[PDB]
Amino acid sequence: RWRQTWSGPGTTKRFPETVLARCVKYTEIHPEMRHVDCQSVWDAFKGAFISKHPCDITEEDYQPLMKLGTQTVPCNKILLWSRIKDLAHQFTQVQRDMFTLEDTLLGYLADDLTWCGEFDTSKINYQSCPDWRKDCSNNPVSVFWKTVSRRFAEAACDVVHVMLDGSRSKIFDKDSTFGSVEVHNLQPEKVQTLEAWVIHGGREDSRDLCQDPTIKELESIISKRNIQFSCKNIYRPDKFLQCVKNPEDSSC
Ligand SMILES: *[C@H]1O[C@H](COP(=O)(O)O)[C@@H](O)[C@H]1F
Ligand SMILES: NC(=O)c1cccnc1
């Protein structure tokens, strides 16, 4: 038609085939996931949102999928990130012992994808899907990420690291998924310290951004949860990348 139901982009093309293929690839590479039945995972993923009103999705809708995608992640090697997707993933593609959410099976399946269904019908909506702000918060994509992000934060222990973008207006943003979900789901019983890495923009290599007002807000929130807060400036991201990629580099 000339008119779309929703304001957000619609389901990604070939969504069913892509989720299936990503599940196949992941379960072949990661030996602990050998037992996973990819067709079952996809069936669980479909059942969460097909035939459901795309503004009435629940965390319970995703429970069969969460159960099939159960994964033990090394609890002390978690990298959270906020608003600095590319660098965080470049880092874990090189430093293979550390994991972002998108390096887990469920995160990897859904990364950069959009999906929604229609109430009272079995089809996937390839035309449009609800936008979190303009349409509704309880939509398939938003509910998925809230659910898996909580579970990922709950798995963390010891020192948890978070990469933040120092070139942004709000380096720490309380309204981000990091700030609204992950920070409040770290377990004080298990997590000793949250350590922030504030990644500077090009050019500005001097200001101590760990004294930034929003970092101080993060510190206060974390401290009041009985978790220690630590912060480091990455003043020059080029040198940081040089050193991550080649840690024998005697300049590092
Ligand atoms: C969960 O949320 C952050 C990325 O979301 P955002 O803060 O950029 O909104 C990651 O740490 C994921 F684990
Ligand atoms: N909630 C989200 O949009 C999101 C995006 C990327 C990683 N984790 C969470």
Curated annotation (Swiss-Prot):
Coarse class of the protein's main subcellular location? other
Q: Name one GO cellular component term.
A: cell surface
EC annotation from Swiss-Prot or TrEMBL: 3.2.2.-, 3.2.2.6, 2.4.99.20
The cysteines joined by S-S bonds are: C23-C38, C55-C136, C116-C129, C210-C231, C243-C252
What else the UniProt entry mentions is: A cell surface antigen recognized in lymophocytes by multiple mAbs.
According to its UniProt entry, the function of this protein is described as:
Synthesizes cyclic ADP-ribose (cADPR), a second messenger for glucose-induced insulin secretion. Synthesizes the Ca(2+) mobilizer nicotinate-adenine dinucleotide phosphate, NAADP(+), from 2'-phospho-cADPR and nicotinic acid, as well as from NADP(+) and nicotinic acid. At both pH 5.0 and pH 7.4 preferentially transforms 2'-phospho-cADPR into NAADP(+), while preferentially cleaving NADP(+) to cADPR and ADPRP rather than into NADDP(+). Has cADPR hydrolase activity.
Annotated protein name in UniProt:
ADP-ribosyl cyclase/cyclic ADP-ribose hydrolase 1
Tell me which species this is from. Answer: Homo sapiens
- Range within the parent protein: 45 to 296 of 300
